[PDB]
Design a protein around this nucleic acid. Structure first.
Lengths: 94, 46, 271
RNA sequence: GCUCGCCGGAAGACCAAGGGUUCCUGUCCAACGUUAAUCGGGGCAGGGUGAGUCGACCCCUAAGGCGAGGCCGAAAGGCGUAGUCGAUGGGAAACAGGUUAAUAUUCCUGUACUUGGUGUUACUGCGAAGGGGGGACGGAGAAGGCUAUGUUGGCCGGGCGACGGUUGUCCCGGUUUAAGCGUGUAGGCUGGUUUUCCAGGCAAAUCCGGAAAAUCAAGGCUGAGGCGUGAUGACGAGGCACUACGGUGCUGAAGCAACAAAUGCCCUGCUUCCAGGAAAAGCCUCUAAGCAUCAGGUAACAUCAAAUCGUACCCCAAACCGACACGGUGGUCAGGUAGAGAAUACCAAGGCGCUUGAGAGAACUCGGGUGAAGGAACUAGGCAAAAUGGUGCCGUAACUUCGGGAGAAGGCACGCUGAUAUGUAGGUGAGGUCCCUCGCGGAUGGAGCUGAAAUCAGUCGAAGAUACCAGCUGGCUGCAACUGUUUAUUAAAAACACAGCACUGUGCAAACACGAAAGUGGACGUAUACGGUGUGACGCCUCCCGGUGCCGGAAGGUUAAUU
RNA sequence: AGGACCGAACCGACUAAUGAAAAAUUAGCGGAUGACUUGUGGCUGGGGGUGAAAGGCCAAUCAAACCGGGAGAUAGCU
């Protein structure tokens, strides 16, 4: 049982990319940016409540931040957690 | 030719890392000194 | 028996094996085993405290019974076994009550021999009883110095002690060194000589053998530089000084016993 | 794109360590790249790392670390008990195919497995900080059984030749398929089952150990591979539709047999040797306190569960350690022909041509090739080159510690073809036939397959161990017995070490060593042991105690604090 | 059987000629079941360690490491 408030905080964004699109189309799997602390179960819960859609399974991974250079000064982008969430057969997501 | 530095992360940490430094009085002193100096990287710890 | 090995290579030429067939060809009694890691002759400070120790073969520790307290229960000798931890051979015995122990194998002992500890026990080889009960003139081994402690004198491959006298609460032992020593008469002792008496006839025959026995090589002080040893230095071979340890103390002759606490027990020093 | 060349026990493929975006795409060429650069491991932007079963985490411990109390120490702190950490070791579980520009045992497809809860009905002794078993272990050697893998034939598809021949004993390609489940084999280990008692296993034990007694000779454990299923599937040479020339979608034949065969597996086995070969948990089992008709245990079945972190890419290197796009770096994989071979040569798969080129064809330098006659005359010195170089057989001195010396020396044979023998000796081994406690069984049988070595006869060349590969040999002699070790980076030796020898200390709270100490090593050793010193295999051997040391003595002389 | 023999890997470094290289190269060379070699981790600390002993090695540094301090040591010398 995850708290409503917690759930709302978990899910950061949808991730747009070719791969993501492919996943959506073929495998019925949505690619989300989620909180770095968000566990799989929590993510699933969030998905179910907040998008109103049955979840088969969630795979997560941590994306490491790229090191960049703004002019002369070096600086690193933040790490962030990506989640492939596979929706059950016949579940169409808006 | 096998040069002197042959890195190993665990070994480095055990040797020089924060916890090791903390463990002894002299280590602590070193840390303090570093702090005083204004070091950004207080220890070898990443 | 001793066996001079045929010189099919140098390093085998001068080898003499001591091959006893009556030893157990097999894995030892595992309950009585325990771990025994190597020092390298280095103490808790991590410094080398005794030179020339290092390496050699992994060895288990057989838990030998030197206290020898199963009084009244007769044991029977199951087998003789190789112990890597000592010059003697050990013997796995089986008490009538089902317990097993290792003991130093004495001279005549073999599989099937019955042995017994206690005051009542028969004065025969391998039997153990207090030296007040043991007849004067007898050869004993595995001799306790303090009652109850465990055998400390005469444990090595072909050693034994003579009970020369029993004067009241003490008995006088003629130790293998030639030292005559008073010992409390209630101290325990095992009848006969300890076993593996042709141990001294073995000859290692090569450098490697020594190494295998955990003995690193020994450098001569005279081969060193003066900063290292008192004998060091000299152009060519010089040695114009009285022999001494690496720590400057005389080596040829100078006595080093300082124990004033046990001077009373020493009847006569060895010669 | 087509040729050419190089690596191929790597200059290929996959990891660890280390790095940390170098990966992929688009875009830009100032700088960086030893030249140019449209290219890049460079700049900028975007994308990319998907796990119950791989690894970490986790449970367990080794060396070792920390260490409540504690012992010790001016202080700081040292050592260490209980404990708790610490992998490089022990501990549950996944395979095949398909897919991305870039991930995959992680996605998808198929087919699996594991150990937890929870609930069940069925049963009914459960229970640990404890007991026992197990885990649990060395070197070498030898086979035998296997597979990986390869070769040939069969089969299936395609081919009929840019130049003489090529419808055949011809040419090219393919002929692949897992874990799991079932079977429990080659083979290895052990005698089982029941009963009774017992000073043992810190207490108890129905467990282990020990005693008896009965009765049956098969009982159990282990075990590669094969076979079956998994699989009416998947993959499949290439054909056929579309084409953003990147590829996408459909389709799909055969898919067998024999022989050879590992250093891999059975094997943590067996045999043997002495130098005598981790630990703890998981796992099995036994009970105690306990609880007692409850919990807990095992039984299947249902359901839920398996979080977290790593996953790109380089990894003998242009990405790690070397200031550089400059030598070092642990593991795994190991095709063909020749060969003893992981050597060597040429090749496969795959990967590269080393980020300045173009000419010229002087001296001189580097790295190679050949050389008349002579053959060490060179030189400090045959330094360097040259030479020797294989298998089999014959043959082989002094001296010797009887092992050696010895590959001593020195010689002969060596290709190809035919025959012996349309392929032998051997190896393997199908049908058939017989037996049978019935199976992965035993006999007999020899088809097919594979296959040296030799002899005889012929034959070609200047030359047959034809290339690469691959000892120079002998004689006298110093030193050190020997194998070893050593001045990282001018010294590898006659130096150090060595087995052996001798002296000497040391009686165990050992001498000695590290420690203001506690303590630790010596050693869980005990004089056939340990320390120190010298000598240095083996053989034959090996006067002086005045000096300096050490050992013993203590009559006298002298002699501190103290008084 | 073997600190046995010939010989790749692997470990080394006797001869030779020659910055890519602050010790390498190519050609030969020694050991190659052991007193072998190697990965990972651990321990020993500066008059201290370790040393089959060369004053060797202890982070390209060794007859006393490096870093900071006494410290602007002292310098009848340049």
């Amino acid at each position: 049982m995850i708290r409503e408030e917690r759930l709302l905080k978990v899910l950061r964004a949808p991730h747009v990319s070719e791969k993501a699109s492919t996943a959506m189309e073929k495998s019925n799997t949505i690619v989300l940016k989620v909180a770095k602390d968000a566990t799989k179960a929590e993510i699933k819960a969030a998905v179910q409540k907040l998008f109103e859609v049955e979840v088969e399974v969630v795979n997560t991974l941590v994306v490491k931040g790229k090191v960049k250079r703004h002019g002369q000064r070096i600086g690193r982008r933040s790490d962030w957690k990506k989640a492939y969430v596979t929706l059950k057969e016949g579940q169409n997501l808006d | 030719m096998k040069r002197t530095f042959q890195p190993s992360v665990l070994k480095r940490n055990r040797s020089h890392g924060f916890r090791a430094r903390m463990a002894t009085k002299n280590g602590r002193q070193v840390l303090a000194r570093r702090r005083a100096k204004g070091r950004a990287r207080l220890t070898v710890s990443k | 028996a001793v066996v001079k090995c045929k010189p099919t290579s140098p390093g085998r030429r001068h080898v003499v094996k001591v091959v006893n067939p009556e030893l157990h060809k097999g894995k030892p009694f595992a309950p009585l085993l325990e771990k025994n890691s190597k020092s390298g002759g280095r103490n808790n400070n991590g410094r080398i405290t005794t030179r020339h120790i290092g390496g050699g073969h992994k060895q288990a520790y057989r838990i030998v019974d030197f206290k020898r307290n199963k009084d009244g229960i007769p044991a029977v000798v199951e087998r003789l076994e190789y112990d890597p931890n000592r010059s003697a051979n050990i013997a796995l015995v089986l008490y009538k009550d089902g317990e097993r122990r290792y003991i130093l194998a004495p001279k005549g002992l073999k599989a099937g021999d019955q042995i017994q500890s206690g005051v009542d026990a028969a004065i025969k080889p391998g039997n153990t009883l207090p030296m007040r009960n043991i007849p004067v003139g007898s050869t004993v081994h595995n001799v306790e110095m303090k009652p109850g402690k465990g055998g400390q004198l005469a444990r090595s491959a072909g050693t034994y002690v003579q009970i020369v006298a029993r004067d009241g609460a003490y008995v006088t032992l003629r130790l293998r060194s030639g030292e005559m020593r008073k010992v409390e008469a209630d101290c325990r002792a095992t009848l006969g000589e300890v076993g593996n008496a042709e141990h001294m006839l073995r000859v290692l025959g090569k450098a490697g053998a020594a190494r295998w026995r955990g003995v690193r090589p020994t450098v001569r002080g005279t081969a060193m530089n003066p900063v290292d040893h008192p004998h060091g230095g000299g152009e060519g071979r010089n040695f114009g000084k009285h022999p001494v340890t690496p720590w400057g103390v005389q080596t040829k002759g100078k006595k080093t016993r300082s124990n004033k606490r046990t001077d009373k027990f020493i009847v006569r020093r060895r010669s």
